[PDB]
Amino acid sequence: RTFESVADLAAAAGEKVGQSDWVTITQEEVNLFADATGDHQWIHVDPERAAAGPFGTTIAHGFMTLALLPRLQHQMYTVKGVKLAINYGLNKVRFPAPVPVGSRVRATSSLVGVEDLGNGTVQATVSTTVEVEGSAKPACVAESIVRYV
Protein backbone atom coordinates (compact mmCIF):
# COMPACT_ATOMS: atom_id res chain seq x y z
CA ARG A 1 0.00 0.00 0.00
CA THR A 2 1.37 3.45 -0.89
CA PHE A 3 0.18 6.41 1.11
CA GLU A 4 0.45 9.54 -1.04
CA SER A 5 1.40 11.73 1.92
CA VAL A 6 1.25 11.93 5.73
CA ALA A 7 -2.29 13.34 5.47
CA ASP A 8 -3.36 10.15 3.73
CA LEU A 9 -1.64 8.06 6.43
CA ALA A 10 -3.40 10.14 9.12
CA ALA A 11 -6.74 9.60 7.36
CA ALA A 12 -6.07 5.84 7.49
CA ALA A 13 -5.68 5.86 11.31
CA GLY A 14 -7.21 2.72 12.75
CA GLU A 15 -7.00 0.66 9.54
CA LYS A 16 -5.15 -2.60 8.91
CA VAL A 17 -2.06 -1.80 6.85
CA GLY A 18 -1.25 -5.24 5.50
CA GLN A 19 0.79 -8.43 5.90
CA SER A 20 4.43 -9.04 5.04
CA ASP A 21 5.73 -12.00 3.08
CA TRP A 22 7.42 -14.78 5.07
CA VAL A 23 11.05 -14.09 5.91
CA THR A 24 13.46 -16.85 6.94
CA ILE A 25 15.59 -16.29 10.06
CA THR A 26 19.17 -17.20 9.20
CA GLN A 27 22.15 -17.96 11.42
CA GLU A 28 24.21 -15.32 9.68
CA GLU A 29 21.65 -12.62 10.53
CA VAL A 30 21.56 -13.81 14.17
CA ASN A 31 25.41 -13.68 14.22
CA LEU A 32 25.48 -10.19 12.68
CA PHE A 33 22.95 -9.09 15.29
CA ALA A 34 25.10 -10.52 18.12
CA ASP A 35 28.19 -8.75 16.67
CA ALA A 36 26.30 -5.45 16.31
CA THR A 37 24.80 -5.40 19.83
CA GLY A 38 27.25 -7.38 21.99
CA ASP A 39 24.75 -10.11 22.90
CA HIS A 40 26.56 -13.37 22.11
CA GLN A 41 24.50 -15.51 24.45
CA TRP A 42 24.98 -19.17 23.66
CA ILE A 43 21.24 -19.70 23.01
CA HIS A 44 21.65 -17.49 19.89
CA VAL A 45 25.16 -18.15 18.56
CA ASP A 46 26.47 -21.51 19.81
CA PRO A 47 24.88 -24.38 17.80
CA GLU A 48 26.52 -27.06 20.00
CA ARG A 49 25.43 -25.60 23.33
CA ALA A 50 22.02 -24.56 21.90
CA ALA A 51 21.37 -28.08 20.65
CA ALA A 52 21.77 -29.30 24.25
CA GLY A 53 19.68 -26.41 25.63
CA PRO A 54 15.92 -26.17 26.31
CA PHE A 55 15.18 -24.79 22.81
CA GLY A 56 16.94 -27.64 20.89
CA THR A 57 18.59 -25.34 18.31
CA THR A 58 19.71 -21.68 18.25
CA ILE A 59 17.00 -19.04 18.57
CA ALA A 60 16.76 -15.42 17.43
CA HIS A 61 17.28 -12.56 19.89
CA GLY A 62 13.90 -11.14 20.90
CA PHE A 63 15.35 -7.69 20.27
CA MET A 64 16.13 -8.80 16.72
CA THR A 65 12.61 -10.07 16.03
CA LEU A 66 11.36 -6.67 17.31
CA ALA A 67 13.95 -4.85 15.14
CA LEU A 68 12.55 -6.62 12.06
CA LEU A 69 9.42 -4.42 12.33
CA PRO A 70 10.80 -1.77 9.90
CA ARG A 71 11.81 -4.41 7.27
CA LEU A 72 8.44 -6.21 7.51
CA GLN A 73 6.32 -3.04 7.57
CA HIS A 74 8.22 -1.86 4.48
CA GLN A 75 6.73 -4.87 2.60
CA MET A 76 3.24 -3.82 3.78
CA TYR A 77 3.29 -0.08 3.06
CA THR A 78 5.23 3.09 2.25
CA VAL A 79 4.54 6.79 2.88
CA LYS A 80 5.35 9.42 0.23
CA GLY A 81 6.57 12.94 0.98
CA VAL A 82 8.63 11.88 3.97
CA LYS A 83 12.23 12.98 4.48
CA LEU A 84 12.94 10.43 7.21
CA ALA A 85 11.21 8.05 9.64
CA ILE A 86 12.56 7.61 13.15
CA ASN A 87 11.76 5.12 15.89
CA TYR A 88 10.02 7.13 18.63
CA GLY A 89 9.65 4.14 20.96
CA LEU A 90 7.52 1.14 22.02
CA ASN A 91 4.59 0.69 24.36
CA LYS A 92 3.81 -2.93 25.36
CA VAL A 93 5.87 -5.68 23.68
CA ARG A 94 5.74 -9.44 24.45
CA PHE A 95 7.59 -12.40 22.89
CA PRO A 96 5.25 -15.38 23.58
CA ALA A 97 7.23 -18.00 21.63
CA PRO A 98 10.88 -18.30 20.56
CA VAL A 99 11.95 -18.05 16.93
CA PRO A 100 14.25 -20.98 15.99
CA VAL A 101 16.96 -20.21 13.47
CA GLY A 102 15.73 -21.64 10.14
CA SER A 103 12.08 -20.86 10.87
CA ARG A 104 10.00 -18.35 8.88
CA VAL A 105 8.15 -15.37 10.39
CA ARG A 106 5.54 -12.99 8.98
CA ALA A 107 3.90 -9.87 10.33
CA THR A 108 0.53 -8.12 10.17
CA SER A 109 0.12 -4.48 11.28
CA SER A 110 -2.67 -1.97 11.91
CA LEU A 111 -2.46 1.80 12.55
CA VAL A 112 -3.59 2.39 16.15
CA GLY A 113 -3.40 6.21 15.79
CA VAL A 114 -1.67 9.02 13.88
CA GLU A 115 -0.86 12.27 15.71
CA ASP A 116 -0.27 15.55 13.81
CA LEU A 117 2.95 17.07 15.18
CA GLY A 118 2.86 20.13 12.88
CA ASN A 119 4.63 21.25 9.69
CA GLY A 120 3.96 17.94 7.88
CA THR A 121 5.42 15.72 10.66
CA VAL A 122 3.22 12.91 12.03
CA GLN A 123 3.67 10.22 14.65
CA ALA A 124 2.03 6.86 13.97
CA THR A 125 1.30 4.23 16.64
CA VAL A 126 1.28 0.76 15.06
CA SER A 127 0.25 -2.67 16.39
CA THR A 128 2.06 -5.70 14.95
CA THR A 129 1.79 -9.46 15.38
CA VAL A 130 4.79 -11.45 14.20
CA GLU A 131 3.82 -15.09 13.65
CA VAL A 132 6.20 -18.07 13.38
CA GLU A 133 5.36 -20.65 10.70
CA GLY A 134 3.73 -23.87 11.98
CA SER A 135 2.93 -22.41 15.40
CA ALA A 136 -0.17 -20.81 16.98
CA LYS A 137 1.73 -18.85 19.63
CA PRO A 138 3.06 -15.53 18.23
CA ALA A 139 6.75 -14.67 18.16
CA CYS A 140 5.88 -11.08 19.08
CA VAL A 141 2.93 -8.77 19.79
CA ALA A 142 4.13 -5.17 19.81
CA GLU A 143 2.88 -1.58 19.80
CA SER A 144 5.48 0.73 18.25
CA ILE A 145 5.74 4.43 17.46
CA VAL A 146 7.22 5.91 14.29
CA ARG A 147 7.72 9.63 13.60
CA TYR A 148 7.46 10.55 9.90
CA VAL A 149 9.39 13.77 9.30
Add this chain to the structure above:
Amino acid sequence: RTFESVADLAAAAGEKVGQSDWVTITQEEVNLFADATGDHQWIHVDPERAAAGPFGTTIAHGFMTLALLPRLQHQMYTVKGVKLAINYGLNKVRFPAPVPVGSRVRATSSLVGVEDLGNGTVQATVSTTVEVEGSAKPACVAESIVRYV
Protein backbone atom coordinates in the same frame (compact mmCIF):
# COMPACT_ATOMS: atom_id res chain seq x y z
CA ARG B 1 27.24 -7.43 41.39
CA THR B 2 26.69 -11.21 41.62
CA PHE B 3 23.33 -12.54 42.73
CA GLU B 4 24.04 -16.02 44.15
CA SER B 5 20.52 -17.17 43.15
CA VAL B 6 17.13 -16.00 41.85
CA ALA B 7 15.91 -15.85 45.46
CA ASP B 8 18.64 -13.29 46.07
CA LEU B 9 17.50 -11.38 43.01
CA ALA B 10 13.90 -11.35 44.35
CA ALA B 11 15.14 -9.93 47.69
CA ALA B 12 16.74 -7.00 45.81
CA ALA B 13 13.50 -5.83 44.18
CA GLY B 14 13.29 -2.08 44.51
CA GLU B 15 17.10 -1.61 44.42
CA LYS B 16 19.51 -0.06 41.91
CA VAL B 17 21.48 -2.84 40.18
CA GLY B 18 24.24 -0.68 38.73
CA GLN B 19 25.79 1.37 35.98
CA SER B 20 27.65 0.17 32.90
CA ASP B 21 30.92 1.40 31.47
CA TRP B 22 30.89 3.85 28.56
CA VAL B 23 30.69 2.03 25.21
CA THR B 24 31.42 3.65 21.85
CA ILE B 25 28.81 3.09 19.11
CA THR B 26 30.68 2.76 15.79
CA GLN B 27 29.64 3.04 12.14
CA GLU B 28 30.77 -0.59 11.69
CA GLU B 29 28.27 -1.68 14.36
CA VAL B 30 25.50 0.45 12.86
CA ASN B 31 26.16 -1.14 9.42
CA LEU B 32 26.15 -4.68 10.84
CA PHE B 33 22.83 -3.85 12.55
CA ALA B 34 21.40 -2.63 9.26
CA ASP B 35 22.56 -5.89 7.59
CA ALA B 36 21.14 -8.04 10.41
CA THR B 37 17.70 -6.36 10.44
CA GLY B 38 17.11 -4.97 6.93
CA ASP B 39 16.82 -1.37 8.08
CA HIS B 40 19.24 0.51 5.78
CA GLN B 41 17.67 3.93 6.15
CA TRP B 42 19.98 6.73 5.00
CA ILE B 43 19.91 8.43 8.45
CA HIS B 44 21.85 5.41 9.83
CA VAL B 45 24.08 4.28 6.98
CA ASP B 46 24.55 7.02 4.36
CA PRO B 47 27.24 9.42 5.59
CA GLU B 48 26.76 11.84 2.69
CA ARG B 49 22.98 12.02 2.93
CA ALA B 50 23.08 12.05 6.75
CA ALA B 51 25.84 14.64 6.72
CA ALA B 52 23.33 16.70 4.72
CA GLY B 53 20.23 15.82 6.77
CA PRO B 54 18.74 17.13 10.06
CA PHE B 55 21.22 15.31 12.31
CA GLY B 56 24.42 16.33 10.41
CA THR B 57 25.85 12.83 10.75
CA THR B 58 24.63 9.23 10.87
CA ILE B 59 22.66 8.17 13.98
CA ALA B 60 22.18 4.70 15.52
CA HIS B 61 18.96 2.74 15.00
CA GLY B 62 16.75 3.17 18.11
CA PHE B 63 16.22 -0.59 17.94
CA MET B 64 19.97 -1.03 18.25
CA THR B 65 20.41 1.26 21.29
CA LEU B 66 17.50 -0.60 22.93
CA ALA B 67 19.22 -3.91 22.04
CA LEU B 68 22.36 -2.79 23.89
CA LEU B 69 20.48 -3.52 27.17
CA PRO B 70 21.78 -7.10 27.57
CA ARG B 71 25.47 -6.15 27.03
CA LEU B 72 25.22 -3.12 29.32
CA GLN B 73 23.32 -4.97 32.08
CA HIS B 74 25.88 -7.83 31.90
CA GLN B 75 28.50 -5.21 32.90
CA MET B 76 26.32 -4.47 35.98
CA TYR B 77 25.30 -7.85 37.46
CA THR B 78 25.00 -11.55 36.88
CA VAL B 79 22.61 -14.15 38.28
CA LYS B 80 23.97 -17.60 39.27
CA GLY B 81 22.05 -20.88 39.15
CA VAL B 82 20.41 -20.16 35.78
CA LYS B 83 21.05 -21.72 32.38
CA LEU B 84 19.98 -18.77 30.22
CA ALA B 85 18.20 -15.44 30.16
CA ILE B 86 15.49 -14.73 27.55
CA ASN B 87 13.86 -11.45 26.55
CA TYR B 88 10.16 -11.72 27.48
CA GLY B 89 9.25 -8.19 26.46
CA LEU B 90 9.05 -4.46 27.23
CA ASN B 91 6.46 -2.32 28.98
CA LYS B 92 7.58 1.05 27.56
CA VAL B 93 10.53 2.45 25.61
CA ARG B 94 11.29 6.02 24.54
CA PHE B 95 14.27 7.48 22.64
CA PRO B 96 14.46 11.13 23.76
CA ALA B 97 17.74 11.94 21.95
CA PRO B 98 19.44 10.44 18.88
CA VAL B 99 22.78 8.67 19.23
CA PRO B 100 25.27 10.15 16.78
CA VAL B 101 27.55 7.44 15.41
CA GLY B 102 30.93 7.63 17.22
CA SER B 103 29.24 8.74 20.47
CA ARG B 104 29.56 7.05 23.85
CA VAL B 105 26.58 5.62 25.74
CA ARG B 106 26.19 4.32 29.31
CA ALA B 107 23.28 2.75 31.16
CA THR B 108 21.92 2.78 34.74
CA SER B 109 19.39 0.08 35.74
CA SER B 110 17.12 -0.65 38.73
CA LEU B 111 15.14 -3.75 39.62
CA VAL B 112 11.40 -3.01 39.48
CA GLY B 113 10.18 -6.44 40.50
CA VAL B 114 10.77 -10.15 40.34
CA GLU B 115 8.08 -12.72 39.68
CA ASP B 116 8.71 -16.40 40.41
CA LEU B 117 7.24 -18.44 37.55
CA GLY B 118 8.09 -21.83 39.02
CA ASN B 119 11.03 -24.34 38.45
CA GLY B 120 13.95 -21.84 39.34
CA THR B 121 12.60 -19.68 36.48
CA VAL B 122 12.00 -16.06 37.51
CA GLN B 123 11.06 -12.95 35.55
CA ALA B 124 12.72 -9.64 36.42
CA THR B 125 11.24 -6.29 35.40
CA VAL B 126 14.08 -3.78 34.96
CA SER B 127 14.15 0.01 34.44
CA THR B 128 17.06 1.36 32.38
CA THR B 129 18.16 4.79 31.31
CA VAL B 130 20.76 4.97 28.59
CA GLU B 131 22.63 8.30 28.54
CA VAL B 132 24.67 9.52 25.56
CA GLU B 133 27.80 11.58 26.32
CA GLY B 134 27.06 14.72 24.20
CA SER B 135 23.42 15.55 25.12
CA ALA B 136 21.28 16.32 28.22
CA LYS B 137 18.42 14.02 27.11
CA PRO B 138 18.74 10.21 27.49
CA ALA B 139 19.21 8.05 24.41
CA CYS B 140 16.76 5.49 25.74
CA VAL B 141 14.42 5.00 28.70
CA ALA B 142 13.09 1.42 28.85
CA GLU B 143 11.25 -0.89 31.16
CA SER B 144 12.15 -4.46 30.10
CA ILE B 145 11.37 -8.00 31.25
CA VAL B 146 14.02 -10.68 31.47
CA ARG B 147 13.20 -14.33 32.19
CA TYR B 148 15.98 -16.30 33.93
CA VAL B 149 15.52 -20.02 33.09
